[model samples]
Target chain A: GEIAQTLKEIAKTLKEIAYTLKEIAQTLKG
Target chain B: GEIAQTLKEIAKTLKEIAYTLKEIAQTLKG
Candidate 1:
């Protein structure tokens, strides 16, 4: 249970990082 | 200069993301 919860957290964090990367790419273009 | 540097930063960030994803998968298995 705890491990699954931690996995969820890591997934969320990684997803956010991906979105942030997209934002950075956009910023570079603009 | 600035754009190239930003591109390098992006590459580094993506590499980190890749490594992190690997860690997450390992965590899932273990």
Candidate 2:
């Protein structure tokens, strides 16, 4: 249960990191 | 004194994240 919870949070974080880093690249290019 | 170096380290980390997450997606697909 705890592992799944941590995985859930980690998945959320990965998604955030993906999108945020994408924006960072766009900002850098622009 | 520290801020520039920290930014340097952070830039390294951001690069690592970019590549590593890319591999994760590739692995998931493969």
Candidate 3:
């Protein structure tokens, strides 16, 4: 199951989430 | 368009994403 590797994927996904929120905030601030 | 309120929805959605990620990790962690 690549348990160890899976954690890294989650970390990447979390980073993407953070970026997504920031983009949403900036773009929708209008 | 309730632009301000829309922002709040996004905040809530982002929170959901955080929770969803946690659940996904736990399920795969097993």
Best by DockQ: 3
What TM-score, computed on C-alpha atoms, does each candidate reach? Answer: 0.51, 0.50, 0.48
Model 2 chain A weakest lDDT span, ten residues long: A3-12
Give DockQ: model 2. 0.04
How far residue B2's Cα lies from its native spot in candidate 1, in Å, is 0.6
DockQ for candidate 3, C-alpha atoms: 0.06
lDDT of 1 at A1: 56
- The candidate with the higher lDDT, 1 or 3, is 1
Question: Cα deviation in Å at residue B25, candidate 2?
Answer: 19
Per-residue C-alpha lDDT of model 1 across residues A1-30, encoded as one tens digit per residue = 565556555555666897775565555545
Over the stretch B1-30, how does candidate 3's per-residue lDDT look in tens digits? 365456555555666797665555455545
Q: What is the docking quality class of candidate 3?
A: incorrect
Which regions in candidate 2 have their CA more than 4 angstroms from the true location? B1-30
Point out the worst 10-residue segment of candidate 3 chain A by lDDT: A1-10
lDDT string, candidate 1, B1-30, tens digits: 644554555566668777666655555576
- What is the full ranking by DockQ, best candidate first? 3, 1, 2
> How is the predicted docking of candidate 1 categorized under the CAPRI scheme?
incorrect
Q: For residue A12, give model 2's deviation from the true position in Å.
A: 0.4
Candidate 1 lDDT at B13 equals 62
